[PDB]
Amino acid sequence: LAFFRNMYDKYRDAFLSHLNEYSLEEEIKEHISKYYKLLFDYNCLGGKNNRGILVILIYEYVKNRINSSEWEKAACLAWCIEILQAAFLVADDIMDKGEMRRNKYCWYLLKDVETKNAVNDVLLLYNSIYKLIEIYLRNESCYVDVIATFRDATLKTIIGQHLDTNIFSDKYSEIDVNNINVPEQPVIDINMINFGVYKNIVIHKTAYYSFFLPIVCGMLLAGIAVDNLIYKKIEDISMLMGEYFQIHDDYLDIFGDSTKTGKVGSDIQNNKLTWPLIKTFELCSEPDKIKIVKNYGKNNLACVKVIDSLYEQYKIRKHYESYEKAQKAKILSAINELHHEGIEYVLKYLLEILFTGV
Amino acid sequence: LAFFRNMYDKYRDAFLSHLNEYSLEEEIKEHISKYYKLLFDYNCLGGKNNRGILVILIYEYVKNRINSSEWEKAACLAWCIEILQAAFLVADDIMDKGEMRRNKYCWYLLKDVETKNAVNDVLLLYNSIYKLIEIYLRNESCYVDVIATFRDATLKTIIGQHLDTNIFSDKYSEIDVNNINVPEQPVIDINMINFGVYKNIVIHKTAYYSFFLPIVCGMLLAGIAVDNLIYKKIEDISMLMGEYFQIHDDYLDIFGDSTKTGKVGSDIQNNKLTWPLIKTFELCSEPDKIKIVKNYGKNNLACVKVIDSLYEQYKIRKHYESYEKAQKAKILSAINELHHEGIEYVLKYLLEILFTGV
Ligand SMILES: CCCCCCCCCCOc1cncc(CC(P(=O)(O)O)P(=O)(O)O)c1
Ligand SMILES: CCCCCCCCCCOc1cncc(CC(P(=O)(O)O)P(=O)(O)O)c1
Numbered sequence: 171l172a173f174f175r176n177m178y179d180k181y182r183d184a185f186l187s188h189l190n191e192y193s194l195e196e197e198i199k200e201h202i203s204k205y206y207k208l209l210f211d212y213n214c215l216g217g218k219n220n221r222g223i224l225v226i227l228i229y230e231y232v233k234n235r236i237n238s239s240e241w242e243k244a245a246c247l248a249w250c251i252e253i254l255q256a257a258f259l260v261a262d263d264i265m266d267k268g269e270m271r272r273n274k275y276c277w278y279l280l281k282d283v284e285t286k287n288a289v290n291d292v293l294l295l296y297n298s299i300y301k302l303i304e305i306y307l308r309n310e311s312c313y314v315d316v317i318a319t320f321r322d323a324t325l326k327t328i329i330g331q332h333l334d335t336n337i338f339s340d341k342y343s344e345i346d347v348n349n350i351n352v353p354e355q356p357v358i359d360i361n362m363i364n365f366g367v368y369k370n371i372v373i374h375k376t377a378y379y380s381f382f383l384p385i386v387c388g389m390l391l392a393g394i395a396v397d398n399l400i401y402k403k404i405e406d407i408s409m410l411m412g413e414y415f416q417i418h419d420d421y422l423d424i425f426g427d428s429t430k431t432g433k434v435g436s437d438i439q440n441n442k443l444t445w446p447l448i449k450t451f452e453l454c455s456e457p458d459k460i461k462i463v464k465n466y467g468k469n470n471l472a473c474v475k476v477i478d479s480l481y482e483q484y485k486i487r488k489h490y491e492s493y494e495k496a497q498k499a500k501i502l503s504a505i506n507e508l509h510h511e512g513i514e515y516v517l518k519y520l521l522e523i524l525f526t527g528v
Numbered sequence: 529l530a531f532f533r534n535m536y537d538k539y540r541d542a543f544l545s546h547l548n549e550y551s552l553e554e555e556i557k558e559h560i561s562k563y564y565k566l567l568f569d570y571n572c573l574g575g576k577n578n579r580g581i582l583v584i585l586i587y588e589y590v591k592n593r594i595n596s597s598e599w600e601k602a603a604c605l606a607w608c609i610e611i612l613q614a615a616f617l618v619a620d621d622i623m624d625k626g627e628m629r630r631n632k633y634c635w636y637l638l639k640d641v642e643t644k645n646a647v648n649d650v651l652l653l654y655n656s657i658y659k660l661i662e663i664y665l666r667n668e669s670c671y672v673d674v675i676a677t678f679r680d681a682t683l684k685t686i687i688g689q690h691l692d693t694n695i696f697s698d699k700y701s702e703i704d705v706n707n708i709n710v711p712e713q714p715v716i717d718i719n720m721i722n723f724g725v726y727k728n729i730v731i732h733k734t735a736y737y738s739f740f741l742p743i744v745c746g747m748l749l750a751g752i753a754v755d756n757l758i759y760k761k762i763e764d765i766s767m768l769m770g771e772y773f774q775i776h777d778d779y780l781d782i783f784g785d786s787t788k789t790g791k792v793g794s795d796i797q798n799n800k801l802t803w804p805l806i807k808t809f810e811l812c813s814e815p816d817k818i819k820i821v822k823n824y825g826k827n828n829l830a831c832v833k834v835i836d837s838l839y840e841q842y843k844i845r846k847h848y849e850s851y852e853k854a855q856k857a858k859i860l861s862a863i864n865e866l867h868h869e870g871i872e873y874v875l876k877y878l879l880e881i882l883f884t885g886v
């Protein structure tokens with residue numbers, strides 16, 4: 171619980187210790203270690219760690235208490251999720267052309283790193299996960315299923331980003347394998363602006379790895395049978411939380427202090443299907459849909475200001491407040507159908523600190 | 529090459545079929561399918577497939593013959609290696625700023641793709657491997673070890689590229705987390721120009737995934753005990769072949785026909801530690817080391833020509849011929865110490881078609 175934040179060095183060093191036994195000259199081993207120590211420290215730390223904590227809490231309250239050897243396996247899984255998060259955020263910042271993350275410059279922007287290194291380093295963080303899982307859970311019975319869950323959550327997240335990045339592109343309105351020169355100028359597509367499509371995306375890009383994966387890890391580790399019907403109930407609660415979480419992420423993109431959120435809002439300029447876009451479209455007048463189509467997705471201050479002002483005009487802040495209230499209720503209703511008092515507590519607890527933390 | 533080249537569609541479609549069962553609207557499922565079918569087709573096909581073939585041949589000759597159900601598991605592992613190769617090459621081309629690969633434009637250059645998609649797609653190809661391995665070998669006893677081998681070969685390759693890309697950088701002569709502005713202009717470092725360091729790199733970036741991984745897969749699948757002392761003999765032969773193979777790759781970078789190799793030589797402009805660089809440095813005069821340092825790593829045709837002409841002047845073509853002859857001998861000497869006539873045949877056979885194919 172507090173156990174968690176202090177176990178970081180243990181797992182970081184376990185992994186770095188694997189690197190250190192490679193057949194490399196000694197000057198090179200030292201340099202590798204400096205680099206990969208910074209990679210982990212810079213990218214895994216400084217987060218709210220809600221996904222990691224969720225593995226730890228699910229583990230405790232699924233059981234009747236847990237020795238400090240069993241805790242070591244729990245916290246390992248917990249840091250793996252936080253490393254997965256690190257890997258994804260490094261990648262997302264390359265794809266979304268990010269500036270700031272957790273209040274510092276994005277990894278890929280550092281001049282001793284650059285994109286060439288950033289990409290390589292994503293795949294390293296990602297694989298570190300499974301090396302760590304092998305070190306601490308090779309001999310557990312859930313081993314194969316735990317690595318199977320990380321794998322299948324990751325795949326859903328990958329398709330998730332794929333749609334996040336491409337739902338408005340010419341591709342989706344045959345792929346031209348001879349064009350390496352003429353870039354499409356980003357333009358929204360009206361057919362795609364609807365909650366149905368938005369849910370598909372947000373569920374795949376967020377719900378599985380942020381909520382399903384950590385919940386299922388804890389349970390798997392605590393001995394709960396994979397075949398059990400509680401998993402399909404957990405999957406549906408995970409879908410609702412992810413929707414709830416991502417829409418909040420989208421709200422912060424427009425209305426959050428970039429010093430408080432740690433990052434800079436870019437959804438409009440990057441042509442993203444976001445909840446405020448969809449809500450404004452279902453509420454606004456025809457003259458304003460034209461105004462939306464001719465200003466969205468353009469990396470141009472005056473165009474962005476048009477869209478932000480429409481969001482002020484159509485009182486989107488008030489509409490969010492209203493959504494947050496209704497969804498929180500749909501979610502609590504789903505939690506109370508689990509009939510498991512421990513998980514129910516953890517999920518209610520999570521639902522409260524989802525935006526604060528700690 | 530018979531069974532193998534025709535089983536592609538089977539494994540491609542298995543995986544695409546997994547994607548198609550995701551909870552997505554039907555118009556999106558169709559678009560996903562077009563895209564991911566092209567991703568596989570465009571990037572897995574058109575290679576010499578030497579690593580795939582090596583899994584198949586090791587599998588046959590380790591045994592006394594194999595039903596078409598057991599062949600299905602073999603060819604699966606074989607295509608997984610070729611998919612791994614595909615994933616790596618898509619990545620390498622982003623990192624090395626590639627133009628052409630297997631005689632077509634690099635994936636990341638296509639305008640419907642771009643880097644943002646290329647990166648996402650690498651992680652998808654990579655994860656497709658383990659999904660496929662689960663489909664066809666979940667119930668085999670070597671399952672856990674086979675996925676353990678892919679994982680540990682990939683890690684070595686990642687550190688391999690890391691050194692390939694960074695051996696000459698200021699990092700390696702402390703990383704500044706506040707510099708996003710002053711990009712270092714690439715310049716060689718004299719201390720690093722030596723075979724010792726070169727071996728470290730080429731072994732990690734090539735030897736493990738191109739030779740050790742496919743050999744060890746076949747053996748694992750054929751029931752050979754993981755603990756056996758034949759594996760450490762196989763590892764050392766793998767190091768010698770990888771050195772042999774990569775040096776040839778480096779030679780082709782300057783002296784190969786870009787229509788025959790399918791790619792454009794870029795080692796000099798990208799500031800790479802290559803075998804010809806090291807050999808020229810061992811042989812050349814001080815006025816030419818200055819000439820090397822001034823012109824290497826600059827993305828400029830006239831600078832590259834200066835270095836190419838030094839490579840002509842110092843008769844590097846003849847020096848390669850000489851290396852190829854001695855190493856081929858060191859390799860055959862190692863093969864003959866295996867005391868296993870089947871593997872010995874496959875490895876001798878591989879050694880011959882390593883540059884032609886088929
Ligand atoms: C092999 C290298 C390829 C690996 C790439 C795997 C793709 C997974 C990364 C994307 O997954 C994400 C899911 N939800 C959230 C984010 C954060 C951002 P947003 O969702 O773009 O709004 P933000 O925090 O800036 O608002 C990222
Ligand atoms: C997270 C996304 C990145 C995932 C990390 C995977 C990086 C591993 C790439 C290793 O790639 C290669 C290994 N050996 C050989 C080559 C031949 C190339 P080069 O000579 O090394 O440029 P070529 O001459 O064929 O162009 C490539």
Ligand SMILES: [Mg+2]
Nearest residue numbers: 262265266334
């Ligand atoms: Mg994004």
Ligand SMILES: [Mg+2]
Nearest residue numbers: 262263266268
């Ligand atoms: Mg983003």
Ligand SMILES: [Mg+2]
Nearest residue numbers: 419420423437
């Ligand atoms: Mg956002």
Ligand SMILES: [Mg+2]
Nearest residue numbers: 620623624692
């Ligand atoms: Mg390279």
Ligand SMILES: [Mg+2]
Nearest residue numbers: 620621624626
């Ligand atoms: Mg290259």
Ligand SMILES: [Mg+2]
Nearest residue numbers: 777778781795
């Ligand atoms: Mg090369």
